[PDB]
RNA sequence: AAGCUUGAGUCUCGUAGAGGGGGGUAGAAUUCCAGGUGUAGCGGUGAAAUGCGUAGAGAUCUGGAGGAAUACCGGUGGCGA
């Protein structure tokens, strides 16, 4: 109801999907979008554009909270970790900080091995 | 039968290391329990379904624990048969 100018975004991009959540630095979420929830499937569900449209759908949030100043905390290897920021920083918001927060085992317990075809 | 020493070794004073054994306890990440903010998806893939989803998931912030495995330093750098 009142304009507070400030927020923080949490972005995760994988080889199958991309997630974009808008929060306040008090940890409190205000809205979220995904590349799967954008209506995308298969090898296309992770794409830079399926994530770009998810960022445009998320950039409609927080209008009544009047947020413009933005920090971004990024995760995952997926191509969606770039187009999402570019589009959100064009949709009225201004970036001040981008930091990678990918949680990593350093190092244990046995190396991953999956899907051989 | 008896000398000699080069063979082998030890001692004085020093050199180096993820060698082994006994007993402590600490740096994080899967994951799950519990609450705030929050909403309809998440997971897989050439596609998917079982499965997890309003019984409020995933995302975020926080509180917490068992147990396995221990980044950087770390290298033409080392130890053990």
From Swiss-Prot:
It holds the Pfam family Ribosomal_S11. Keywords: Methylation, Ribonucleoprotein, Ribosomal protein, RNA-binding, rRNA-binding. Located on the platform of the 30S subunit, it bridges several disparate RNA helices of the 16S rRNA. Forms part of the Shine-Dalgarno cleft in the 70S ribosome. HAMAP family: Ribosomal_uS11 (MF_01310). Belongs to the universal ribosomal protein uS11 family. Has been predicted to contact the N-terminal domain of IF-3 based on footprint studies; exactly how IF-3 interacts with the 30S subunit is controversial. PANTHER family: 40S RIBOSOMAL PROTEIN S14/30S RIBOSOMAL PROTEIN S11. Part of the 30S ribosomal subunit. Interacts with proteins uS7 and bS18. Cross-links to IF-3. In stalled ribosomes contacts ribosome rescue factor SmrB. This is Small ribosomal subunit protein uS11. The lineage of its organism: Bacteria, Pseudomonadati, Pseudomonadota, Gammaproteobacteria, Enterobacterales.
